[PDB]
Amino acid sequence: QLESLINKWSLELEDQERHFLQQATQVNAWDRTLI
Amino acid sequence: NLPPVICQDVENLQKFVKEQKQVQEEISRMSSKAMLKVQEDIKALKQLLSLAANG
Amino acid sequence: DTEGFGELLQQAEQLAAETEGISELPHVERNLQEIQQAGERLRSRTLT
Amino acid sequence: PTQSNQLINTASALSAPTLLGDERDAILAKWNQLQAFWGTGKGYFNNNIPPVEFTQENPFCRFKAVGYSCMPSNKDEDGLVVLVFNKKETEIRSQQQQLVESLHKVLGGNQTLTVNVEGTKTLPDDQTEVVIYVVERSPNGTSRRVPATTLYAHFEQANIKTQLQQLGVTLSMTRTELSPAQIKQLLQNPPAGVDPIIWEQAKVDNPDSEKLIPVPMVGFKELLRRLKVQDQMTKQHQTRLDIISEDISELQK
Amino acid sequence: AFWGTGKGYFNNNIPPVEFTQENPFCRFKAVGYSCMPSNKDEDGLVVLVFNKKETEIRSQQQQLVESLHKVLG
C-alpha cells in the first residue's frame, strides 16, 4: 500500500523536478530580458 | 498497520503534490509575447526618434 | 531576419545632411551609371 | 549542539529509522526521503524523539534554483522608505492626501515633519508599492530629508507597525544602497537549504556584479511570484513606451 | 597668530585672543593623504596602542590576553 504511493510520488517528483528547473531557467532568462 | 499520524501526512502529501502541480500548470500558461513586444516597441521608437533628431 | 536597408539609409541621409554646407538649391538623386562615374571622376583626383 | 543534533536526527530519519522494529522501517526510510525531497511532511524515526519537520528550506528539498535581482541604488540620505498596501493604485492615488495625513499622524502629527509620496506602482494580486520620504524642518528654518534607515527604524516599532497595518500596509522596507561590507557579508553564507556548490557557482553566473545579487528560488510558488512581478513590470515598460511614443509624436510635429 | 602660538592682547576689559596652531592665520599648514580602513565592524578589529616594545607585548601575550579578558569582566 504505502510503497505503491511512494513509487508513484517518486515518478510524480521526477516529473515536477524537471518542470521546476526548466521554469526556473525560463524565469532567469525573463528577469535578464526585463532588466 | 501504521501510526494514524503517518496516515494523515500521506493525505497532507496528496494535497501538497496537487498544490504544486496546480502552480506548475498556472506557470505553464504565462506567455513572453508581452515582453517580446517591449523589444518590438524599443526598436521602433529608437528608429522614430532618430528620424526626429536628424530632421 | 527582416530588418532591411531603410534603417541604414536613414543613417546615410544623416551623414550627407550633416556634411551639407546648405546650398540655395537641392541636390540630384544620380542614377547608378552617374554614381559609377562620380566615384571614378573623384578617384582620378585623389590618385594625383 | 542544536544544529548538530538536528542533522543527526535528519540523517537517522533518512537512513535508519527505528519506529516500527521490522522491515516496515525500510519503507519508512523511503517515506521520510520522499517527504524531504518534496520539502514537506514529517520524518518519523523513533518513539522517544520528535519527528524531523520537513520544510522547503530543508537541504534535501529538490525544488530549488538561484536567480538574480537588482540591488537598490538610492542613498540613505534620499529617505526612501517603501510601504506595500493591500489596495489598488487607483484607491491609493484617490486617497493620497488622506494617506499623507494618516502617515503624518503615525509620525506623531509633529509640525516639524512633512510626509511626501514620491511615487506609486501597482503590484500583483490587487496591491500597490508606495515610495515615501519625510522632510524635517528645524527650529532655525532649514529643512532636511529624514534618512531611510531612520524612518524605517520608526516604522518597525510594534506600536507604529500595528498602525501601518491598520492603514492596510502588508510590507515595509528601505530601497537603500548596500555597502561593500554588506554585499560581501550577504554572499558569505548559502541561504537556508541552498547547496554550497550552487551558491558559489551563482556568484560566477552573476552577469552584473554592481547592479545584481543572487537570490534563491524555492518551490513553484516563488517562480509564480517572480512571473507575476515580470507581468506587472512588462506592463510598466509598455506604459513608458506609450509616453515615449506621444513625446516622439510631438517632436516630429 | 602666524607662528600659531602666544596671545593677542587688544583691550584692558577683555581676555586676550589665545593663538594655537589651529588658528586660521597659523602658516605651518598643509594637507596630506591617509589610507582609510578596509575591515568590517563584524570583523571585530579594535586597535590598542601600548607604551611597550613589541618584544615585551609578544613575551607577555598570554598575560595580556588574560588581562584584557578581566577588563571584559
Structure description:
This is part of a larger assembly, with 1 copy of chain A (35 residues), 1 copy of chain B (55 residues), 1 copy of chain C (48 residues) and 2 copies of chain D. Chain A is rod-shaped and about 50 Å long. Chain A is 94% helix and 0% strand. Chain A has 35 residues and is mainly α. Chain A has one helix spanning 2-34. Chain B is mostly helical. Chain B is built from 2 helices and no strands. Chain B is rod-shaped and about 85 Å long. Chain C is mainly alpha-helical and 48 residues long. Helices cover 56% and strands 0% of the residues of chain C. Chain C is built from 2 helices and no strands. With 253 residues, chain D is an alpha+beta fold. Chain D is 44% helix and 22% strand. Chain D has helices spanning 2-15, 24-38, 89-94, 96-106, 148-155, 158-166, 180-186, 196-204, 220-252, and strands at 41-43, 52-54, 64-70, 81-85, 113-123, 127-137, 143-145, 169-174, 212-218. In chain D, a hairpin with a 3-residue loop joins strand 5 and strand 6. The longest helix of chain D is centred in the last third of the chain and has 33 residues, at 220-252. The PDB classes it as transport protein. The entry lists the keywords nucleocytoplasmic transport, multiprotein complex, transport protein. The entry is titled "Human nuclear pore complex (dilated)". Chain A: Nuclear pore glycoprotein p62. The organism of A is Homo sapiens.
Layout of secondary structure:
This is part of a larger assembly, with one copy of chain A (35 residues), one copy of chain B (55 residues), one copy of chain C (48 residues) and two copies of chain D.
Chain B lengths: L3 H24 L5 H22 L1
Chain C lengths: L5 H12 L14 H15 L2
Chain D lengths: L1 H14 L8 H15 L2 E3 L8 E3 L9 E7 L10 E5 L3 H6 L1 H11 L6 E11 L3 E11 L5 E3 L2 H8 L2 H9 L2 E6 L5 H7 L9 H9 L7 E7 L1 H33 L1
Antiparallel strand pairs in D: 1-2, 3-9, 4-6, 4-8, 5-6, 6-7
